[PDB]
Amino acid sequence: DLKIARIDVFQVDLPYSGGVYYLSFDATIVRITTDTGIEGWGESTPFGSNYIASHPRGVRAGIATMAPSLIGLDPRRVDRINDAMDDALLGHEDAKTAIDVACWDIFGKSVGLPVCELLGGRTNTRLPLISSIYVGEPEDMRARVAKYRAKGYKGQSVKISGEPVTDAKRITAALANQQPDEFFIVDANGKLSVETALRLLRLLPHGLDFALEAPCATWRECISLRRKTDIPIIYDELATNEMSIVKILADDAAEGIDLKISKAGGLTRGRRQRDICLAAGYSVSVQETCGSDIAFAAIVHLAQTIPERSLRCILECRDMVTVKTADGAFDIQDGFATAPTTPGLGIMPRLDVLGEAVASY
Amino acid sequence: DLKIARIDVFQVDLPYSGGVYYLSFDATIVRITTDTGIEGWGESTPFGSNYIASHPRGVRAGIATMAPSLIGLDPRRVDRINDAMDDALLGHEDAKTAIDVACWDIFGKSVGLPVCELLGGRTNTRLPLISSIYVGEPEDMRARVAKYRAKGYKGQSVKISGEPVTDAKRITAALANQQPDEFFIVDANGKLSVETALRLLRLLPHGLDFALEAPCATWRECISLRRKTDIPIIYDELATNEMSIVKILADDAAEGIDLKISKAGGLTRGRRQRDICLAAGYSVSVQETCGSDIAFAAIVHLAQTIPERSLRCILECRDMVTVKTADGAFDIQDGFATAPTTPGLGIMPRLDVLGEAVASY
Numbered sequence: 196d197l198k199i200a201r202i203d204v205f206q207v208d209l210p211y212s213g214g215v216y217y218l219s220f221d222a223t224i225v226r227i228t229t230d231t232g233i234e235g236w237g238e239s240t241p242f243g244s245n246y247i248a249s250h251p252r253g254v255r256a257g258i259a260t261m262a263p264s265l266i267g268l269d270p271r272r273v274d275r276i277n278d279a280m281d282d283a284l285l286g287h288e289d290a291k292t293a294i295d296v297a298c299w300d301i302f303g304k305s306v307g308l309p310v311c312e313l314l315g316g317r318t319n320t321r322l323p324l325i326s327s328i329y330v331g332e333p334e335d336m337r338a339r340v341a342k343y344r345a346k347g348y349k350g351q352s353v354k355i356s357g358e359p360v361t362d363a364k365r366i367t368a369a370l371a372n373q374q375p376d377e378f379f380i381v382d383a384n385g386k387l388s389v390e391t392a393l394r395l396l397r398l399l400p401h402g403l404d405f406a407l408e409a410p411c412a413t414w415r416e417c418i419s420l421r422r423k424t425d426i427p428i429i430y431d432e433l434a435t436n437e438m439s440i441v442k443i444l445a446d447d448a449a450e451g452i453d454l455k456i457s458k459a460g461g462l463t464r465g466r467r468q469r470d471i472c473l474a475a476g477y478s479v480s481v482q483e484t485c486g487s488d489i490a491f492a493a494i495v496h497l498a499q500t501i502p503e504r505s506l507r508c509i510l511e512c513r514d515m516v517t518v519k520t521a522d523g524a525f526d527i528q529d530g531f532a533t534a535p536t537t538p539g540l541g542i543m544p545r546l547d548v549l550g551e552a553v554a555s556y
Numbered sequence: 557d558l559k560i561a562r563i564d565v566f567q568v569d570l571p572y573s574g575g576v577y578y579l580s581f582d583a584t585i586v587r588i589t590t591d592t593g594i595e596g597w598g599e600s601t602p603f604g605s606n607y608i609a610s611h612p613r614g615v616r617a618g619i620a621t622m623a624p625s626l627i628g629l630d631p632r633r634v635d636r637i638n639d640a641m642d643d644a645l646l647g648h649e650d651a652k653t654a655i656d657v658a659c660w661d662i663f664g665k666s667v668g669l670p671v672c673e674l675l676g677g678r679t680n681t682r683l684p685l686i687s688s689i690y691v692g693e694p695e696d697m698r699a700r701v702a703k704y705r706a707k708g709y710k711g712q713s714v715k716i717s718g719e720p721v722t723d724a725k726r727i728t729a730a731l732a733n734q735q736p737d738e739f740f741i742v743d744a745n746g747k748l749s750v751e752t753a754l755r756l757l758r759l760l761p762h763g764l765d766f767a768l769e770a771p772c773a774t775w776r777e778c779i780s781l782r783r784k785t786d787i788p789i790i791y792d793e794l795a796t797n798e799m800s801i802v803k804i805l806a807d808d809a810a811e812g813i814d815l816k817i818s819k820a821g822g823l824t825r826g827r828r829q830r831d832i833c834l835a836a837g838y839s840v841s842v843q844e845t846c847g848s849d850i851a852f853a854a855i856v857h858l859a860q861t862i863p864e865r866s867l868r869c870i871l872e873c874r875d876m877v878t879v880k881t882a883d884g885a886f887d888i889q890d891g892f893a894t895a896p897t898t899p900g901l902g903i904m905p906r907l908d909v910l911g912e913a914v915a916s917y
């Protein structure tokens with residue numbers, strides 16, 4: 196009754212809004228067209244190739260291997276589509292993401308409903324945006340946190356380098372005037388060894404309220420650290436597909452996850468993981484490795500289905516870039532947003548920015 | 557004093573010697589040339605894209621992302637080369653493999669020594685080849701096991717489907733006349749759920765001597781099963797880089813591993829893992845996902861450095877294909893082989909078979 200007739204891949208250079216990130220992004224955007232003419236869009240944009248086992252060339256290569264096997268399938272059967280992608284290629288959540296998201300776009304358009312409504316129904320609360328406080332001198336970090344607070348942000352992500360003594364001063368300053376209505380995350384991006392994590396935690400003065408995200412690079416190290424601290428731990432890099440989330444629960448390894456759409460594998464896997472976390476009482480932040488307006492659409496729709504008490508902000512990933520790839524109303528107002536109310540993802544890509552497809556199936 | 561001047565990538569179709577595998581291979585071969593003219597070779601050939609998170613297009617895409625960063629580095633500093641590959645791209649052991657192996661080839665040629673001698677020194681014992689018994693009717697499997705026994709093979713790998721009742725009959729028949737000098741492996745290739753693994757193990761009659769390889773798809777399932785059985789367990793698909801091997805030890809999860817060169821990340825990582833296993837008392841089989849004569853060279857040199865008591869056969873991966881990519885003397889004789897004694901890997905590629913490079917850096 197409805198079949199995938201074509202899968203087109205586009206490539207877009209997305210300049211970094213921060214100029215240069217020390218220690219532009221190559222975005223992969225996919226358009227799926229059904230036999231009836233409905234078009235759906237999805238995106239997968241890795242944060243370089245050093246964040247997790249993912250890179251731009253890898254995303255497109257993965258799509259090339261899977262795409263042929265998807266032609267003729269019903270895009271509305273999102274779980275079956277994912278089963279099919281899994282049968283064609285193991286892992287590669289980053290390559291599967293854009294395809295899955297596009298199917299959801301088509302799905303919503305086919306029944307005339309916003310994606311969040313097909314994901315269980317939209318909540319009646321707004322979505323808090325989270326700030327990104329890059330590593331710098333303690334006072335600089337504190338000032339930037341203040342700038343965001345003055346813009347209405349209620350969530351802040353403080354990055355650290357991995358050098359415990361200075362990091363301690365950075366966290367102390369960054370949280371200097373934290374308020375009762377703010378949620379703070381200290382993100383180590385897997386840069387701490389257990390030794391360094393313990394040294395950092397022991398150096399911190401009392402009174403600092405935050406959750407520690409991605410403390411160490413490997414599962415073993417994070418578990419080892421978990422046994423020696425009472426600080427809330429959030430998995431990000433190590434939280435990949437739904438099988439990894441179940442492992443977190445089996446190991447009582449953390450208190451929540453940073454659910455990045457393209458690391459999870461799309462909205463379908465995002466839903467699977469959402470339900471695992473909500474069933475367990477884990478907190479969930481919805482973000483992305485990186486991405487334009489299209490990737491942001493997926494973030495907002497998934498987040499709009501997570502009860503406020505369980506949500507830990509969302510990342511307006513498009514803030515990381517300077518090129519607009521699509522139009523959409525996300526109702527942004529002083530640090531908060533809400534999912535659109537039109538069919539599908541609620542976005543309309545700018546074909547001129549996408550250029551001609553780099554691949555077609 | 558010695559630097560990488562060029563990295564060329566070749567692609568070779570390798571027809572399956574078994575005709576068609578149910579439920580040809582695309583081989584990636586790399587040639588590294590130093591500024592002084594020394595050439596080294598390496599290979600990475602995935603067993604399709606369903607075995608592990610690896611595919612042909614992915615191997616080459618990974619090389620494209622890493623290669624530029626390697627130009628100018630000393631190929632002899634194998635561990636530093638691997639550190640550099642890690643700095644350019646996380647994971648992707650499959651893409652790193654061919655480059656690492658080629659550096660070892662260069663390394664051995666530069667000092668006029670076989671790779672196994674630079675890996676710690678060759679043992680004085682022969683390397684037993686292992687058979688591959690594809691799934692079939694019980695009697696057919698038993699007959700094929702007999703065929704290999706009659707050829708002098710002392711190692712046998714019996715594959716199963718994942719259907720416990722029939723699998724039990726298959727294992728019973730396949731091992732019907734196993735001898736005192738033979739080592740048997742039953743490989744589930746991660747196809748058993750804990751439920752199915754338990755049902756299979758409970759159905760088997762007493763007296764069957766074998767080690768169970770890759771029983772379940774995920775780490776959690778394998779640990780769960782480990783707690784409910786006393787059968788030796790060997791990790792294959794889940795044994796990836798050295799960090800995973802340390803995790804096996806931390807979890808007391810298995811008795812040994814199936815070390816596949818391209819899954820491990822090359823000879824350097826192979827050495828790292830070898831030492832972890834030998835230090836622990838874990839058994840080690842040296843194989844490959846798939847591969848021609850070049851990939852086979854890496855297998856033999858690593859295996860020739862593992863004490864006989866700890867080795868669990870090697871896979872003559874080239875037996876899986878019908879196209880010869882290089883000449884080399886592996887001293888094959890009735891189910892046994894030994895590493896060559898000439899410099900480097902001891903192989904000379906057939907340039908005519910490789911065709912023109914598909915990529916150059």
Ligand SMILES: [Mg+2]
Pocket residue numbers: 382384408409431432453
């Ligand atoms: Mg993070």
Ligand SMILES: [Mg+2]
Pocket residue numbers: 743745769770792793814
């Ligand atoms: Mg195996």
